Design a protein around this ligand. Sequence first.
Ligand SMILES: CCCCCCCCO[C@@H]1O[C@H](CO)[C@@H](O)[C@H](O)[C@H]1O
Ligand SMILES: CCCCCCCCO[C@@H]1O[C@H](CO)[C@@H](O)[C@H](O)[C@H]1O
Ligand SMILES: [K+]
Lengths: 187, 27, 557, 674
Amino acid sequence: LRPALSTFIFLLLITGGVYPLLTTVLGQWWFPWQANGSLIREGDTVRGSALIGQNFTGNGYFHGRPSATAEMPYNPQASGGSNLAVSNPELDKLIAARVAALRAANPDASASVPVELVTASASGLDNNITPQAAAWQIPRVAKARNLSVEQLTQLIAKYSQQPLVKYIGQPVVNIVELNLALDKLDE
Amino acid sequence: MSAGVITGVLLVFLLLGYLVYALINAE
Amino acid sequence: MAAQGFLLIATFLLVLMVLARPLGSGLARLINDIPLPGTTGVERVLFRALGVSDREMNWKQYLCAILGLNMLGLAVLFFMLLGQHYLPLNPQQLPGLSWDLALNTAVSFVTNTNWRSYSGETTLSYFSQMAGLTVQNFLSAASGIAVIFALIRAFTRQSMSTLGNAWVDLLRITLWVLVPVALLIALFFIQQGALQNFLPYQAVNTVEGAQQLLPMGPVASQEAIKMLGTNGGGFFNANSSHPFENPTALTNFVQMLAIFLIPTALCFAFGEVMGDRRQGRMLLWAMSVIFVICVGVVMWAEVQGNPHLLALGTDSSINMEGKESRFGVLVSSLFAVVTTAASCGAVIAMHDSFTALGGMVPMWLMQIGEVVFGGVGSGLYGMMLFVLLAVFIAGLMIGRTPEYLGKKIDVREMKLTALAILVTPTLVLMGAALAMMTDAGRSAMLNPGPHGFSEVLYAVSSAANNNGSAFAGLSANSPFWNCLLAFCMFVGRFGVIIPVMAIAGSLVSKKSQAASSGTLPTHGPLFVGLLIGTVLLVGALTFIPALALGPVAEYLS
Amino acid sequence: FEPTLVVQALKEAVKKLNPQAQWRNPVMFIVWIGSLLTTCISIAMASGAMPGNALFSAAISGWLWITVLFANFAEALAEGRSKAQANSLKGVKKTAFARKLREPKYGAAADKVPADQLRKGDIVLVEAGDIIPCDGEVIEGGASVDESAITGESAPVIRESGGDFASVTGGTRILSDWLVIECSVNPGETFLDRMIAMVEGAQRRKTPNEIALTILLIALTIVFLLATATLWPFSAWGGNAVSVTVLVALLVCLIPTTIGGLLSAIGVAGMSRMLGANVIATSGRAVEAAGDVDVLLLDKTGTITLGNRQASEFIPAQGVDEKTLADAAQLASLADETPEGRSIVILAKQRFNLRERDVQSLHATFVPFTAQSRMSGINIDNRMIRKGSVDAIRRHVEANGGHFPTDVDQKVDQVARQGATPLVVVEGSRVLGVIALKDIVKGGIKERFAQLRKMGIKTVMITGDNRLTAAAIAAEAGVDDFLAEATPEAKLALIRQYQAEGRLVAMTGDGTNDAPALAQADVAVAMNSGTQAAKEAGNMVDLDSNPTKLIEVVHIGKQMLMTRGSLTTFSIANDVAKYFAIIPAAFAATYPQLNALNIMCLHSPDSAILSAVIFNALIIVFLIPLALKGVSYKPLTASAMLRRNLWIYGLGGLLVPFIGIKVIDLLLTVCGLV
Ligand SMILES: CCCCCCCCO[C@@H]1O[C@H](CO)[C@@H](O)[C@H](O)[C@H]1O
Ligand SMILES: CCCCCCCCO[C@@H]1O[C@H](CO)[C@@H](O)[C@H](O)[C@H]1O
Ligand SMILES: [K+]
């Protein structure tokens, strides 16, 4: 029984002590910003990070997908999704509710709503939308902030990252970084 | 639990153990 | 769509075979007791310091060493979760878990399943995740690769009674395969944006009036093991969709490779240890043919998606409901097949919000026995159970005695493989039937209709087969589901390792014989199809009725 | 094999095989339990219960008993042909009295004693007319007996004291003179009881191949038990639960009732054909092992040819009558118990009715056949009669101052052209004529070795002749290779070298001469020996003592392995159509959208389940002749036969249930029954 308990205790100290401490030390050394959440701060207040995802409801800001978390939308303390099926009748009402509400808020845009803005996300903290869905809400943002349609598209494409290969994912716009850049541009 | 249903559950368990016992042996 | 969906499969399999081919050579050395290049002198110093004597063990001794380490594992983990409030590294004041939650999660991680009847950020502390969950993601993965090492040795060794030393394998597996590779994988995650710290929860004052609290913790280190060890247990409630655990599409492609890395290399290793590489390639050939067909079905099913979206005036009928925007529909569809065929359980996208067909294939790939690329040892010896069954029925219909790799299978060995095959399907059908007869089980559903039963069928199917994937619409934090599933996970794991070891000990005492007139080629296309038909028909005859009352009814509804 | 005489005598016993005495068969025991409750319900359901339709469950439960009845009909039919042959030889020994002498010398006072009271060591007297009561050795006297009870041949055979011919078998009948024998076997071990032990049950366990698939059949019924018993709680939630009578009918269908009721009949029918070839096996396990043989060895040392060539014609050369030829040819062949010698005794009675010979009036001494002399004979008259091959006789005739007639040499050359080895009979120093020994096998004997060659089974002849003459017999028979001048150590070297290359070996030979070789061999058939020599070594006994009989032994064991393999593939392949018949029907009342899966377009859900139960019962009767007669497979290699077995019995197992369910359902619609 001596090699049994010794092998267990040794691996428990390596995998539970040496392995996390080594990754943490090397993590904070090479990539300190990413290891601490890649937070975005202005002064001493934490506005967020490039990966959080925020519940934007204002008329001047760009909007993200529905959150469907536990208590409040985009709650990092929940990190859940809408486990509703296609055969579920409550999903159809939620889709129609979002389609009607988005068309009302975006009257000077196409009636076809991008499926991202009507379907919830899996994590509930999604901070990403395809560049076309960010351009679908350009007229609403342009009218609310008096910015031109030209410089608004140029601002979205600036804060848009494409995957290394086209079939590994989809092109993605950083919503939090786009909205924060919109505030400094407005001033 | 219904009387007719609980007897059917007991019948399945007795047939399961009877088959597992038969698979172990060569009868 | 079809062209990009094809390139995603081709690029994934091509890069997979390039990485898994040399790793299979390193695993062949560990099977052949040949140490790794740099790990020659350190082993001697360490093994004597720990008391490991490199002694050879028989199948009864090899089994009691693995079961001894696992029963010791959950005993330590179950008490870590009860006394979580006293152990350090707890920024929040999270209390100790309940007895049903601690028992379920302790059994979960030792089983390599990693069921999640809890929300990570709300339930667990940094110490319980690091000194409890990461430590068990290595041991459960090591225990799986240890069992397959013994079985592979039972095929190459001739007329012996020993299967090696379990303590030497469990040390060599963790220290020079799991830890070093996961260290590189975790570091690449950190660079792309993964989380790895011990900071308190960060408060965020958004640009609007709303305020949110950020969850920190050593996530990146645990992220590399759960994918490489096919554990699938995420630090947060949304494991693989969370931006902190899987930040970019680049890390996601790495996470998909890690699920298929070791279970593919164990096929290259088995083909090298046996000398004839063809015997390992046919096994790899039969798994990839079922894998490619399954991904094409779920991709087509999810691209069709929900037509009510198009009826309500959206841009397309694509089912993005339970998906993420970083990863395409094809990527979420591919990952869904990879994580359920390989028993990983890592959910990139809520499978409950899939379509009728798109959710049935992950359901079906679990019930089939986690044979198609089954992650970490368990999938290889699980397939070997069907290889012995395919060889058995092959000679049974010809009129000759069975013979695999020259060794002739006797009646006693066929009783153990048959019972081992019946383990998981017995637990899912009995487990699901128990839930559909209790108020505590049926009330845990979320969606109505046939999909509601699919939630129960998916839960017990995942637990018994050790996959760990869930629809998550089922709320299983009740003591009924915690006790019911823990029984399926415990019996579904060790109830298969025990007869596999008895199969191992029965095969070494035999001597391989030369090819005779009654021998059958266990390579080439004829045996690949015979193996595919054997695995498909067994799972079909077992789950065709339960699937008709589940996702098939929802499809025709 | 299938007369209305025996069928009626069995169907009555079939209906008697319906009580609670089938728990040893797990497949049919579940079908019996399902038939019990469905009748127990339907009776109470019709009298007074909540369910509303009772004639449907009475029709389902009715066919469930018909399924059990048909399964018992197959087992009784296989046991009907076997028990009939066992009773034919069972009455042969109970007709006998027994007179035991107080003094071992002949002429003492004997009292009639029951035959079953004869023990080892007793001295019994048997004169002409009576039948031999028990086995043993002859101690006084000499007579010709008729061993038709054990071989089916009315040809005589001599049994005299003080020689190699003193072995008498109980149950046979003596014909010519008197015989005093000493019993050597205890009751229950008589040669006739071993034939009874091979036919009757309770003394034959399941063979490894029989135990093989039974483990899969029990594993399948465990799956189909869990797959259907969990449908009730699964369906009771979506709607109304599936009725028990439907769950029982669905389970009885999916359960492999096809082979579960035919498996025990294949073994019983196969052991009967084993006795039909005059081969005695202690258990069925040996017969199955003969089918798994990769190489069989035939020992030709103790006989002239391989045993296929037997007497055909009597040819007198010059101034000799054919009657006087066979009269002396039989006398010389009486001591030749090899197949070549027995056929001459057989041709003696077929053409000239030479049935009995008074041995004592001859005052003769028989010369038994020996491989060294290559001839047998008798010294009845003052002249010596001999019979052998062409080479051995010319050295004997010229030894008696006799010459070879020119006509005799011309006749021998002519018979050699035909391909038959010629044997000659000589009285003293004058040749009587030539005996032709042509091949008996209907087809070419080279083809039987060629068919065995197509399957991959190799044939090697074992003999002691020269390297030049052994190749001639090997070429005329068409065997692969041969071992000439084989010492008992050279035979063990050939067997062990074959086993060292991973090949199961079968061998036929003499129990005494080849004692060490038969023990090392994996499968062994003993020639020219009693059951006692092989019962200790667990080997088979060849009653005809023909080396070629090993070929038929392997073929009988092969059929017993092919029928089991072909029916499992056919029975399991049915489950595809059986699911498309019950899944859309049983769930039509809970999820009606599943009606799209009803590919066969069956009329009504209740008619769908009825047609599946009727097909699950009628397929047993249609496969009874196939299970008992045997599968007529074709000679192929391993991988090639795996494909052909999947084409005929896989597609056939897929398409027959599709067509079968439709016709049964259409007949229910046309007749308007339900
Ligand atoms: C479900 C329980 C399975 C028990 C089957 C064990 C099969 C072991 O097999 C036997 O083990 C012996 C040593 O223990 C060896 O000496 C034998 O060679 C070997 O055949
Ligand atoms: C207890 C009384 C139950 C009566 C049920 C009898 C069901 C008979 O059923 C009938 O049997 C005939 C063959 O005999 C078939 O030709 C018919 O197709 C079939 O309908
Ligand atoms: K897992």
